[PDB]
Symmetry: C3
Subunit: 427 residues, 3 copies
């Protein structure tokens, strides 16, 4: 049957894995068997996840050294500004859709009570300076072993830049050594991209396994009030994709329907693995094989976007903060909701995509606003209710971000004329 699996056409095969996994998950959970799914099905999904994590640091280091050597510093600076401007614009929309859909569904019509008290807290206050200095790795070997994406990005860019300067120096020995070094990262990045392609042979089984477990454990819990939270958040995702990303792509002359079909492997993988960083090898290959984006762009914008994209956060916090407020009957005006989500968005920036993100962040938000989280308390209850569906929300939060990352990469690539247009011609 190993041969019957592989010879089935691979174009949609991963997407079959998703729907069949999700159905199998729901049925298994509804009938009690979510324990069996955890034992027998999930290790196959954990395997998919490990194989992709294995590739993240090599592919990020090697692609960005090769990439940053390939482009001049001035243009790299301009890509940096373009992708940040992009991420501000789209997070502004994400906050908007976060506020609207939460209120449309009017999340939280169940009843606990408390308004407080504090628990009066100040607190930190949230000083970014050390977050910024920490971008510079003090030991680039240590950042690789510890898996720190942002200091590795910084080291890869300066090394890549320096290499190109050396290759333009007069001394031949200097040019040849720098080029040998550049070739090694080219060889390594290339090998990593090859492995991704092989791992993606396994992906439909892995995608099946992961989505099955999530559905078996937390599917049965989407009912009543929490069904409206899932509905609101997923509507928010849908709007962010088909409005914010589609209009911006169209404004810049990219066919948005072509985009989605090229993104699907990145989007589904982001959905089940619930990690922007762990999806990077897939998102980066998609940017290469499918979108036709030059490594000079995506080797920077994608790993950067995996840590700074605020879109999924704004949607999650917008919906879940309202759910908590209505559940405990705390009056929250629209502007006050905006202030809360913005401080959670600002507080989240540096953090890379990691499972269990917004639930941890939501808990911080409730504490900093002075709410009582002691066990048994109404807010502890509302928080626990969100916590129990958190994976179902995490999948959507992660999936909307990688899509936004690809969109912003493709857009900036186009504005730089680093987008290969032949990849977008269909037969």
């Amino acid at each position: 049957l190993l041969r019957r699996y592989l010879d089935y056409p691979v174009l949609w095969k991963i997407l079959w894995g998703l729907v069949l996994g999700a159905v199998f998950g729901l049925i298994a959970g509804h009938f009690g068997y979510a324990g069996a799914v955890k034992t027998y099905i999930k290790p196959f999904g954990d395997l998919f996840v490990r194989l992709l994590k294995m590739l993240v640091m090599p592919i990020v280091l090697a692609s960005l050294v090769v990439g940053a050597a390939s482009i001049s510093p001035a243009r790299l600076g301009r890509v940096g500004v373009k992708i940040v401007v992009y991420y501000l614009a789209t997070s502004a929309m994400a906050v908007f859709f976060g506020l609207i859909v939460g209120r449309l569904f009017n999340v939280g019509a169940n009843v606990n009570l408390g308004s407080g008290t504090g628990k009066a807290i100040e607190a930190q206050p949230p000083s970014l300076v050390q977050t910024l200095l920490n971008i510079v790795p003090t030991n680039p070997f240590a950042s690789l072993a510890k898996g720190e994406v942002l200091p590795v990005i910084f080291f890869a860019i300066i090394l890549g830049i320096a290499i190109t300067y050396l290759m333009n120096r007069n001394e031949e020995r200097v040019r040849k050594s720098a080029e040998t070094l550049l070739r090694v990262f080219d060889g390594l990045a290339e090998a990593m991209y090859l492995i991704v392609g092989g791992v993606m042979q396994y992906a439909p089984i892995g995608v099946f396994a992961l989505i099955a477990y999530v559905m078996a454990e937390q599917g049965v819990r989407v009912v009543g009030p929490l069904a409206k939270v899932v509905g609101a958040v997923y509507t928010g995702l849908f709007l962010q994709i088909v409005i914010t990303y589609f209009i911006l792509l169209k404004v810049f002359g990219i066919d948005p329907i072509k985009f989605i079909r090229k993104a699907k492997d990145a989007m589904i993988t982001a959905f089940v693995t619930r990690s922007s960083s762990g999806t990077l090898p897939v998102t980066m290959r998609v940017a290469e094989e499918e979108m036709g984006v030059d490594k000079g762009i995506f080797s920077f914008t994608l790993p950067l976007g995996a840590t700074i994209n605020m879109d999924g956060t704004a949607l999650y916090q917008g919906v879940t903060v309202l759910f908590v407020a209505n559940a405990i009957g705390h009056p929250l005006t629209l502007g006050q909701q905006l202030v809360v989500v913005l401080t959670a968005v600002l507080a989240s920036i540096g953090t890379a995509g990691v499972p269990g993100a917004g639930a941890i962040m939501l808990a911080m938000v409730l504490q900093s606003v002075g709410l009582d989280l002691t066990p048994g308390s109404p807010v502890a209850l509302a928080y626990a209710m969100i916590l129990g569906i958190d994976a179902i929300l995490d999948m959507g939060r992660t999936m909307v971000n990688v899509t936004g990352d690809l969109a912003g990469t493709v857009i900036v690539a186009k504005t730089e004329k680093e987008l290969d247009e032949s990849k977008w011609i269909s037969h």
Copy 2:
């Protein structure tokens, strides 16, 4: 001429074996007369230096050789070598179980007298770890596994990288080929440098082998007396039988001269003996496989690091003997079948753990714990285990040495069946 120059000018063929024999003799005399403390201070640091110089080479030599190795051979054959080497380790561990049970009962370990309370068996609770042990083969951060010195995920990452590299060197784009080849040369350049450094370290090895064996003999030599002398006897007979019967017959079946083999292995065996680490001997075992046995890197760069973590032979022998010793010491009745189930579960539980000093004592303590015996201080089983624990280094040397031998034997066998053995190294 100074003492430095006369030491190195002595022919190196047997010099490590003199380091072993003079080290062991020196050790015994020092201990019998009280001086084991001075040995620890003055003699032993030189052996520890040997141990560190070899450890230094394990991750670079294993990574670089396996990328080079896995690039040099096609995936299909690499799978076949994988299955061949696994089947070998099953066969030989069965023989190790067999001799472990036999030699233990022939010597009839125990007949010192305590009396124990309780059993058993096998509850308490198990539980299975096997799936997560397999998933853990895949490193989530290959830089971390290197920095943490994890051999089994480095084996996996090295193979995946090597395979990918030749695919790139066979593609059409010239830059893609040219980069992949540069990358391959970097690992080839590094691997070559490590094998050269091993060669340099082995000039120091007789001194190190001397220092290590002297220390172990001085501390635990005096403890081999009475009942415990029979534990040592049984285990070492187990080794001898496993070598001269199991490894010798298999080597003969596949047409390798078993006497030539031992002469070629001796440096790896002695190094395994004193360092008591399969992983830490790998640079020596891999160089023996190259210079002496004449095995292609496509074979031994895989089978040897894998064998350092999966070889069950030393475990079957240790557990076989010592489990009987505690049972007889506490007068607990143990049928031949009951001993067999215990050794097998200790063997199955041990798979995947690489060779590390203090292995069997830790595993033995687990085996007694899982069968429900009372290890509280003062108790008969706590007493019998403490007796084993005190000679454990002497047993550890034999346990490591038999495994690295079995690793070389299976590597040589698989290499021959693959026609990857250089016959010129063997012709008399």
Copy 3:
């Protein structure tokens, strides 16, 4: 102002950062504002420090693999014994100047009281054997990730040596792989040196920010008895430079004023960052571009000197031990002071340059001689006083060491005929 900063001539610009920062620091501190300096000014200096730390492990690894390939093992061994002999000579002098200036200033005429009078009551010999064994890394990838310089030096030397053996082999495949490997380290070292050059465009801003903060916090605290401690220590530095380093440079035929002009960037960076290792990328680039030392020399001697140079320690311990003894009125003979300093110096070897060095070591010395460090006690009081100016002393301690490292590197390079004379001729 982005443009006017860069177009100002770079010749002296870092030293203006130091002087203006130090003046700015003192004034800001005297007026209460050392808190604002910590918030607004210091991150610019911390940024300077991180950018340099980033480069330490790559440049040390790569320069030494390349360097040890470029030169024969025999010469490297002689360079090793020459540089150690150099460090014994100069530390002997540093002990001397430590004892002299401490007593000249007669540090500690303030009055507490208590007397320990005990020796080796801790009690440890101590035992160096494991310290030596620890030179050999058990996992060179681990030592790199942990940033351990001395085992990386060891691994780099043998890898470099092995590489040239392979590049002399008959098999062309072996030769070509080894050369590819050697080119990778050559390419990386080259890139690091290029980046150092860029960071040093920022150095005046960084140097300003660092000296400003230190001056703002501890400048106000150097007064009364503690002013005599700082006076004593900095005179010791001065003498160690203008006497020990200058005479040695002249004995071997190097112009000492030319030397000083060339060393200044390493010296000022050593001064403000208070780390020999963190200054290494700057000290090594200075040895290459300015001194004209071959990489075969400095890629080894300089990282070694960052962990073995005892000059700053001998000076620090000499003065502060006397301050403590006089502050508590404990009679201390000149010979007894010598025995204490040497055991502190022997105890310090192998530790690389790190901020907060001597304060920790002083605390051990007081403890190991049996003095009472419990809160409120005189020695705890005298120790706390030193502790509060420690940064001002640390700057001077690191700056004299990096100077001595460059001095000894240049001497060995000259005796090995690996110094390029065209850089010195003018």
